[PDB]
Structures are given as structure tokens and as C-alpha cells.
Design a protein around this ligand. Sequence first.
Ligand SMILES: CC1(Sc2ccccc2C(=O)O)CCC1
Length: 113
Amino acid sequence: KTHVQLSLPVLQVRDVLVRGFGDSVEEVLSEARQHLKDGTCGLVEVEKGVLPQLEQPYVFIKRSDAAPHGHVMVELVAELEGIQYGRSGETLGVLVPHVGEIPVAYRKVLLRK
Ligand SMILES: CC1(Sc2ccccc2C(=O)O)CCC1
């Protein structure tokens, strides 16, 4: 399938134990994709103060289209020192490893795979 339906647990930035996927744009995009498959990927919503508390490179999910079955269509866009690798819509948040943190909510997304 080109698209996959996922329910991503939304985590509080201060609860997050592992604050990024790695050290290169190519690595964070690979680890992000792997965690999304193993269902070990969380989502932190981007506000004032949130990105400085997380490790670059960032991986964002951004809106790719305007929502089958309640699931918003999104795609992966890494960012490193102000440059993004990818081009897409509004940020739904930043992806992080999930290692058992209690979510505040769930975000239903359709991921281009
Ligand atoms: C990481 C995809 S692939 C995927 C994701 C979750 C569950 C199953 C699969 C699969 O390929 O079968 C979404 C990012 C590319």
C-alpha cells in the first residue's frame, strides 16, 4: 500500500525520554520510518519553547492534502539548522521515539509510504 493508517500517541515535550531519532537528516528520516512501522513513534505538537527542548535533526509530519476516515494525509519532512528536506503543508507536529510515555491524545494520520 502507498498509504498506511496510523494512530500516533501525542506526548508532552517534558515527558519525552528520547528526544530525536539520530544525528543526520538521512538517519532521522530512516529511524522515524522504522519506528512508525514498529508502532514505537510518538508525536509532539510544535509550540513556543518545544523545538529547543528536542534534538536536531527534527522529523515533522506535515499536511500533504485536505482526510479519509478521520485520518489526515501527511508526509515526513526532516529539518537541520533551518533547512528542510522535503516540501509540504502545515506541521501537525514533530516525531520522536515512543518508549512507554503516557499520551495526552491520539492523532489519526494517513502516511505516504
Ligand atoms: C513508515 C511507512 S510503512 C508501514 C508503517 C506502519 C505499519 C506498516 C507499514 C508497512 O510498510 O507495512 C509510514 C512511513 C513509511
